[PDB]
Every structure is written in C-alpha cells, then in structure tokens.
Paper text:
The four molecules at the interface of two head-to-tail tetramers sit on a 2-fold axis, interact with each other through one distal end of the molecule and form a concave tetramer. The structure of gp105 is composed of N- and C- two domains. The N-terminal domain (NTD) contains a β sheet core of 4 antiparallel β strands that is sandwiched by 3 α helices. The C-terminal domain (CTD) contains a twisted β sheet core of 7 antiparallel β strands that is sandwiched by 10 α helices. The C-terminal segment (CTS: residues 589–610) of molecule B is inserted into a groove of the CTD from molecule A. Hydrophobic residues, including F592, M593, V597, V603, A607, and V609, are involved in the interactions between molecule A and the CTS of molecule B. The interaction mediated by the CTS, the loop 303–320, and loop 137–155 are unique and only exist in between the molecules of the concave tetramers.
Previous studies using mass spectrometry analysis identified the phage-encoded gene product 105 (gp105) as the major component of the nucleus-like shell. Gp105 has 631 amino acids and shares sequence homology with other NLS proteins (Chaikeeratisak et al., 2017a,b).
Residue numbers in the entry:
A (entry chain B), C (entry chain E): 49 to 273, 287 to 314, 320 to 582
B (entry chain C): 257 to 303, 320 to 584, 589 to 610
The structure:
Amino acid sequence: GINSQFTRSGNVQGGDARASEALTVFTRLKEQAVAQQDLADDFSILRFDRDQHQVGWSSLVIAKQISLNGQPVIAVRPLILPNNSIELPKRKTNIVNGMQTDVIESDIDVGTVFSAQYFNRLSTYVQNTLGKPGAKVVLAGPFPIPADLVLKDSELQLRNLLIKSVNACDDILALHSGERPFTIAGLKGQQGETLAAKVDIRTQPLHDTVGNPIRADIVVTTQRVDVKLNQVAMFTNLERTPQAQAQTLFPNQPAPWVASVVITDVRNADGIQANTPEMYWFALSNAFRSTHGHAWARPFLPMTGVAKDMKDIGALGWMSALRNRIDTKAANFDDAQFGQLMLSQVQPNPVFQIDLNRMGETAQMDSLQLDAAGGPNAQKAAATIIRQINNLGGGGFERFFDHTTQPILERTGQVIDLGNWFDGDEKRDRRDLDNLAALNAAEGNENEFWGFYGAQLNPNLHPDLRNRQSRNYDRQYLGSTVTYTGKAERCTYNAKFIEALDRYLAEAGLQITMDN
Amino acid sequence: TVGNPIRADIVVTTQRVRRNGQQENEFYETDVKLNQVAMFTNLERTPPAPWVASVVITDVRNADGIQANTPEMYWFALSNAFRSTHGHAWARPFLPMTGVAKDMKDIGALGWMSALRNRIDTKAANFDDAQFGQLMLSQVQPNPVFQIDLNRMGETAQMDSLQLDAAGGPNAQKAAATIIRQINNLGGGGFERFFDHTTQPILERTGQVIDLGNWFDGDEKRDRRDLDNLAALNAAEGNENEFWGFYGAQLNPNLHPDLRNRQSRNYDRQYLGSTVTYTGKAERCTYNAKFIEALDRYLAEAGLQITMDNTSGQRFMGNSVIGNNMVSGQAQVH
Amino acid sequence: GINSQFTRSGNVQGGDARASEALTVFTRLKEQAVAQQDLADDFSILRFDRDQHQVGWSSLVIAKQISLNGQPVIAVRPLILPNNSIELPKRKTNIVNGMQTDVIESDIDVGTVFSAQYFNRLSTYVQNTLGKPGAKVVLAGPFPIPADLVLKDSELQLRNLLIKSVNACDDILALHSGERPFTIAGLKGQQGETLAAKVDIRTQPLHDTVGNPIRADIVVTTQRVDVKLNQVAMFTNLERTPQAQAQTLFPNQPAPWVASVVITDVRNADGIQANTPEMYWFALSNAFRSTHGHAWARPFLPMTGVAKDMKDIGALGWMSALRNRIDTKAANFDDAQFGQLMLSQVQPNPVFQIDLNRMGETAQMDSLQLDAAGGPNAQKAAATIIRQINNLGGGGFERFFDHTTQPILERTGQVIDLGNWFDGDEKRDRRDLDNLAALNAAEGNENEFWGFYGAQLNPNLHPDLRNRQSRNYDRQYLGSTVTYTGKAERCTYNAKFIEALDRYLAEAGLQITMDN
C-alpha cells in the first residue's frame, strides 16, 4: 500500500469497537450465570474479528464442543454484530431506460453477508481454535444483534439470548445424536385433559428475544386442562385479483378482494425449552384453526372508539362500485352490518402465506422451507419435510398426498424487509404498512395506490428497483424514522398441504375444543 | 478529530477499484479509500439568471487509511473537488427529498425573489423532477464558481497559510513561487506551460470573515455554516429589507468589518437558537476560474483514469441548441 | 436448396416485372428523341436485374462512355425502380424497457439500399458490359422512381427525366474535364440590366420532375432586366426554446417561440440547362434575401377568407400567457395587429436549415453538404466547399472567415421523411405536418403537443422508435393515406456562414434591387 510507503511514526484508529464490548459483557454474563448454576460451563464463547479474516461483519460464535460416537463433532451458533460506524460498500445494479442507463445503489443487509464463504471461514477458525480439525461443523441458526441496542443497558435480554443460543446448540447437537422424536401420542394420557385453543386479538405488537417488534394481530395458542404449548402470531392482508376489477369496468351478465393470512411468529411456548421440528409443525397446525367462525376477520371489525387510520375499513369504499370513504364510525357500526359488508366485499375463504426469515430466531428451520420451494436442493428438502411430518404423526402421512405430485409451497418471488418505526411511545413493526393502510392513507387517488401495489409486486421490474420504491413509499408514510434490520421472503402454502396436514393430525389424535 | 462538526452535504470520495475479479473478499471494505473532500453549496446574488451558484470547499482531509499528510495529498484532494460540475452534482442538495419538511433548506425560497411573490409548492405532487430541472435553468446560472474556507487555526493550518499568503501580501510572490513548485512536484509535466503564476493570481479573498461555531438542536450539534443565504430566505420569508440586510451584514465595502461581524452574530442569534457558541475564525476565498481547469487538465494529461456514473420527468423540453444561430441583421440591399 | 431436391417439371414466376416495362419504355423514348434530333446517340441505357447480382433494388443506369486525356473514364447515373410486389426484409432493432425487451421492425427506405457495395457492383457491371475495365467511374446523383407512377401513362415526365439525367451526366463529365467556372463577372456586362428579386407566396406545392410534391410556401427568384436565373423554394417552421417556457411557469423580474426557415428546393432556372456548383451557390445566396421586410413571415399572415386549420395562427393562443384559440377570423384580422402579434410572439430574427436529401434531384451536391457537417471525410469537404465558393467569387473569400475555425453547418441529428398525402383533388407534400399545424390539430392538450414535439426531437430516444412514433402521428393526422418515398437529414447553417457569403457576393458584385 501507500501507508507503509512513508513509514510514519503514528497509528490511528483500530477498526473494531463493538466487538470488544460485546465480548466483555458476554463473558461477564456467562460467568454470572455459571456462578449460580444456571448453565453448564462445558460450552465456550469465542470472538471473530472482522479485520483478521477478511470478512464483512464480525460475528461471535457459541460452541458446545461435545464429541459423538468416538468422532469429533462441533455445533456452532453465530451471532452477528452490525456496526453503524463501519459502512461496507453498497451494491450497484444497472437499469436501462429508453436509450439511457442508470445505476441504482442498494444497501447490503445482514442476510447477504452470511455467505457460504463466511460459514467456511468461521468453521475453519473454530476448528483451529478448538484444536479438532477433523470435527464436523453444524449451525443452529445465525441471529443478528440489532444496532439500536446499547450494550451497557441490555442485561436481561442479552442473558436470555445467550440462554436460548446455548439451548439451540444443545438441541441441534442432540438432533444429530438422534433422540426419540416427540409424537402426539406422548401428549395424550390417562387424564382427559384435552387440549384447547383461546385465539385472542392484539393491538400492541409482540416482542422478540432482543426487543425487535413484530406485527401480530391474531394469535392462536394451545393449552392443557398454567401450561401452554404453542403460540402462532399472524395478521391479515388483502389482495386484489385481476378478474374482479375487470368485472367492475367491463361487467358481464365472487368479490373484489381476497383475504390473505401472513404467519409471522411460529415460536413455541415460553415455558417449554426444547425446539424441535415436531414442535414447529405442531405449532403450525394451529395456523389453520383461526378460520373457525371466520375469526381471522376479527381485526377488520371496527375498533372500540379508536380511529386508527391505518386500519379503517372505509378504504374499501375507495375501491368499489360506490365512492368515497365509508362512514363506518357512525351509529351504524354494528357487528351485523359489518358481517354483511364482509360477506359482499371479500371472499369467505383465505389464503395462507409466511414471511420466512433467513436470519430469524428459527432461521435454521426457515431455511428448510426456502429450499423446499425451489433451488437446486429441492427434492431432498421435500423428503426431509415429509419424513419429519411422518415422524411427528407416526402413521401413513404419504396416503393423504404425495409430495412429488404437488408442491409444498410456492416462492412467489417477493421480498419483505423487516424494520421498526417510532410513533407516540411504543414502537411498532415496519410490516404495518400493508395494503389496506396504504389505501386509507392515499384516501383515493387510484394511481397512487396502484403504483404502491406494483412497487410491492411487479414481475417486470428489477428487484432492486422494487425494493428502492418500497423503501421510498415506506419513508413517505408513517413518518421518516423507519429503521431496517433484515430481509424476508414471503411464500404461500398450497391449500392441499394444510388441508391434509390438519386432517392427518385429526386422524392421528386431535383432542382440541374451541368456542366462538 | 475533536467533537467539532463541519457542515458538509456533498462528499466526493476517490478510491482505488480492484479489477482482479473480486475474489477472496466478499463484501470486505479492505482499505481502498484514497481521499475525500467535503463541501456544500452557497447561493450568491448579482445586481440572465440572477442567482449564481457557489461551492465552498470545507473539509479537505484525506482518508484514514493513509497516515501521512503531504502537500501532494492536498492537491490531489483539490483536483478531486472539481469533479462535481459533471452531471450538475452540486445541484443535488437543492433537490427536495420526499417525506421531510425540515425547512431552511427548501428550493422554493427563490420564489420570494422572482417576479411573483410566492413560494413554489415544493413538497406537492406537481413538483416533479422535470419541473425542478426547469426551476434551475430558469433561475440559477448553470456554472458554479469555486470558493474555499481557509482556516488559520485548522487541521491544515500549516498548509492553508501558503494559500492565505498567496491571496496577497508582503510574501505573496514567495507564496506563489513555492505553491507553483509544490504543485509541479506532483506530476512533473511542466505546470508552467498549462498555467503560469506571474500572468494572473491563483485565488482572491472575498473579504468575508466567516467564522466557525457550533449550535445545538434536536439533541445534536451542528456547524454554524448551516445558515446560508437560502436558509435566511426561508427563515425570514418573503419580507424585504431584512434578507438584503443579512446579505450586507455578510459583506459590504462601505463599513468597518467589526460592525458587520456584530450584525452577523446578532442575525445568527435571531434566526437560529441562541444556544450557539463560537469557536474560531476562518477566511473565505475564491479560486481562479481557469486555474482549477488547468489543474484538472494537468491531472488528466499526467494520467488518472477516473470513472463516474449516475448523474441526473423525461418529457422533451425545447431544443436548447437552436438559439445559437440567429443570423441577426438583414442584407439591407440598396 | 430444396427446390432442386425434387427436380419438379415446372418453373413458376420470374421475380422481375417493372424492369422489363421500364427498359422497353426507355428504349422507345430514347429512339423517339434521337429520331428528331433531341439527344446525341453517344450515350447508352443499360439494365441491371436485381436477381442476377444479389442486390436489393434493381436500378437501371445511364452511361455516356466518353474518354478523356487518353485514358478511359465512365460517368454513370443510376435510376432505382422500387417495386411494391417484392418486399425486402425489414430491419429489426431492440429496445430495453424496465426489465423487458422489445423488437421494433422498421421498413427499408431507398437511401439505405444504395450502399457502397451496390455502387461497386454497378461499377463492375458497367465496366464488364462496356468493355473498359480500366475506366474511372463517377456518379451524377442517383434518383429513385416513385412506385405510384404508372409506366404506360408517364410519357412527358419520363422523357424529361431522361433528358435531365443525360444532361447531369454530361455536366459531371465536363466538370471532371475542368471547364471554365462561371463567375458572377460573366453576368454583369455593358448593359445596365441589373438583377432583381420578385419573392412570391404560394399555396399549392411545387412539383418535381416526376410528380412528387414538395412543400413550398415562399419562393425567391432571380431575374434580368423572359429570362430567369434561380428559384429557391422554402417554408417556415416554429420551434420553442427551453428558456422561454421557463420564463412562463417560473417568471423573473425575448419571445416564447423562434422562427426557423427550412430550404426545400434549390433548383436553378427551368430555362437554363447546365447544373454546376456555382449555380448552386448563386441560387442559395437568394435564400437569405427573404428576410427583407420580414417577408418570410408572409405565410403567417391570415389567408384571404380561408380557414386552413393546418395554418391557423390561433395555435399561438394555446401556448401563451392567455388561453384558448385566438379568434383572428373576426373583424380584427388587420395586418397591423398581426404585426404587433408577430412582434410580441416570435423573435425578429430567423434561423436557417435545409432538409438535405441523400437521393434528391441534386443528391450529388447534397452529399457534399452532409460530409461537410460530420463523418470521417470532413476537412476535405470543407476545403472543397471553400474552394468552390472562391472559384465562384474569384476573390479572397478566406478573409471573411476561416472554415477551420467555425463549422459550415451542424448535423442536429434529425431525420425528416418525405412522402405525399391525398386530400380533395391535388395531393400535397408530407412535410406539411410541421409543428404549428400539429398544435392547431391538437387544439390544446399540452401533453399531446409536447409528445409530438419529443417524437420529432429526442436525443434520449432510439432513432427507429422516433421514426415509428412520427409515422404513427402522421397517420393519425391528415388522414390515413400517407405514402412515404425517401428520407432526408435536416441540417442548420451557421449564422456566420450566410452572413459572410452574402457580404462576399455584395463585395464581388451584387446588382439586385427588390421592393417590399
């Protein structure tokens, strides 16, 4: 280089600030926890400087270091530490318009940093540090640390994150060890303590293990008889089919909207500690129950005296045979008239989809879902998912349908970015923009709403341009204080998949009763 | 280096680009930044387009990767600073950004000084990119003059003293000789041919005694340079005899500079928060119009492959070239 | 191929229809003309079948076959015969929009067919036919035969075309022989028969030697004292500078339009026979005189009781501080108020430009003008043009200005296609669309007029797309019966060029008086 050309008698800056603080606080928390017998000291925490290995983001790893069957095996869980001080170079793409060309520069998320080369470098680093070059390396699901967090004032959440990380490492190591899978037959016993569902509606968002908010309008949960089993949090979105609008301009001698349910959080119970595929599917089975009594339409019911311009059903007036916002806030806000309005505005059957996260708290399990919907490793993922479902059920799940005949889920080629925004006192998830809220904010102006919808969905537009337009529209609404954390891909389950999974669970034993 | 802030909204960064296939380093910044220059845009006025654009170079420090501060780095940074008139990049900060109404930076203030006494609905939907590109051709001359704030007690004070002396004084000739020697000791292509020093001066002081302070709002600090002419126009609205009063307090020949400095301090206390504090004093100067062009031509002929991109809805607006040939005057044949 | 694969006992079609008829009628006309002593029989007419030499359009040549200085030299004038029966393959271009790409297919004109390979093939064909391989080949300017013409009913015009073709061949052969150039001093003599100009306004278009109409609103002509010298036909067009509209939306404490004069026909007198560069420049010198008394504004003066919606000045009302079409057809149509309107709507100084034709009746001379404005052969063209002007004048024309210092003319990167359309009884030139007529037809609708103007002029659009949009807008207006013949490039002279040419002619002798 040129710094060594002159050999000046001075060294400025270090190039690493947050990693040292994180290592110190993590060592302090580990020592405090092991002092009072909270965690076994068998596991170790390491450090991975970004400069010393030519990597984008410095991420510290958690390792268990337990062998198996006489051969060495290592299980590692990453923990990325993005830093605002260091800004890695952006990504440039070229778009041709007319005769001219333009360059769009887009920021680099945390998902794109965790490349295969990064995994290989971390694997070789941990192999060299732990002195077992022949060990087998597995991952329990990398999880970023949000940059807004302050290290000196995050005791409880950091301790909980460490505990969950070591639990996940132990769980993946045990799964490689091949324990006994938990079938539904274990739940049922001599006592007639049948399971139950207490679906509930929420307004304030749920919180991650760190503090990142995630939007959740309806939650479905499983109880015994004190004891909880599952909790699936998800909200409702509306989409417009091209044929419905066609039957509005050019009529002919259905409904103008379709209802979509987006699963966001699929975590198991707080009380339970282990995390296994059978837990994941037993929890996901509850994501279909919300359709009982059309309960998924509960958020669309008018709020108790609260305007909430991001959830006004009057936007349906802007897109209908009639015009103007519907004055639902009058004395005619009764639940019955809302019932006929829903009967004649949206179809009575929903569609299920999930914003699968490549770097969520269950990113290891979401990765299987992404591979099951496309890419080179597709058939093997289908075999794994079907065999996991069979192990859960214990019966002939292949009879209900064949994986090779119909796809498990479709990719749909959409990207949803996760973030948070500040309003009033409590922050909310970025994913509150939706389409109904955008239509309410636009208060008409067909062109603006159609442009926003195209910005979210356009097969003929470059993905980077679509992301930039979505970011611009996000900044336009709900203020200009949005902060982005990660990226997720939205994929829709096939109807037959759930329609057979719930039936198979019922055949194999489903002792749940709900009232609505 | 210290916690003092510097007003800077346009940063021109020059760095090396690896063309070895981009391998064994995915999304790794390494250390490729050569040097950066930080500058803003100021709008002066004349007694065509009335408003004349001006670019004031504020920060000239080189990248943290290098640890040696030599004159050649300084002149490389000055050469870099010129690479902003390409694509009218100096007009980018004047472009409104959707979603923010922070004020005291909007372009609509020029409307107060136009034929009509109104502010253009800048944030509205009717103000698009094509309309903005009109407001510019209609209003500001499309050639930016180059200024620079020499700091007597700044980071590059031992180097800024050379230009301050070359502005004119007892050591002006020696300063010109040494600055010519320094710039020629960068490429060795004979700077005498491209641009001499005895023929015309290199930089002229404008007489402004602009000074560096600090003012706090919104739970952060910022530099006192944020109050330019456009900010004063926005803050004081379309009223007259107070914007011209501010411009005169900024500079007038027919009064002692102490009174105008006191008036400028009073105005700074008035428009922005009274919590402002003052740190040091600088001196504004204007570079020669063709000296920078000669420097850029030198750097080009010596050999520096520098690549640009981007640059500035798209419906057609006039030929812009037919006006060249007017063939004024008939034959007047008897 | 596959036709010879089966060797069927049948041969269908010939692939050439119009060439045989043209050869027969041309032989008949040549024999009739030479019978009564009209043309010397030294020249010969040939035939060039399109199939026998792998060429696009079959073109018949006219050759003189006269040697010079003891070495053989041949002068040939082509004559292209486009046929509607045979449609040559189109030209495909690709335009990228967003992520998608589209292909635009454009027709092939007559200008693009006459490639250098075509010239070489014709040269070798005439060398082989005439038995002089070492002869030097020169061209007198190829000229197409319009497809709408019927061969059996075109006696007079075809005979005149043949006579003009042989005259042009003789003229180019003589110019290569190096005769005495005709300076202005030859015109002046003992008699005080000073030259004069009788600029006149026209409505019906002038006609070519075949019948193709060319728009001509003002003509400037040179007379003696029965005897005519020159006739330059040209019309007026209006263009909008970007600064004028800027001073309308965003004002500040000139004129909204600029006047352009487009020279179309630069032919010499009908009576005179020779065609030489001195004739061309002596005629072009008259193209500046029209500015006397602002006479070029005469077409803008309201017509005598005729609406003529393609020439209404009321379009200026649509583009002004006021609104709506100006009711000029009222009792306030006096010439004075039109004078103040012109004083305050357009600048009092015009700009000159010419729609140079690569395949016009003077295409050989227009080619020099195209090379003078760009391309590789640029400086040599400037030397030739300046030396021709000097030979015309006989004095130091280099003193007035230097060609190497300022360009003679600018290309401007515009293409104007020539054609004709049918209305009422008499057809008119395609070039009547203009901009003022388009604005009148649009009767407002800022977007439509701006889109049309951009379709004519857009540096950021592909030339093929611009041509297609211009064709579509042409078909939209003035009916859907437009027929295209050739393509021309519009180039604007520099002001100094004419401002010095007229002055140099005045210094060298300019005895012309006009009254207006």
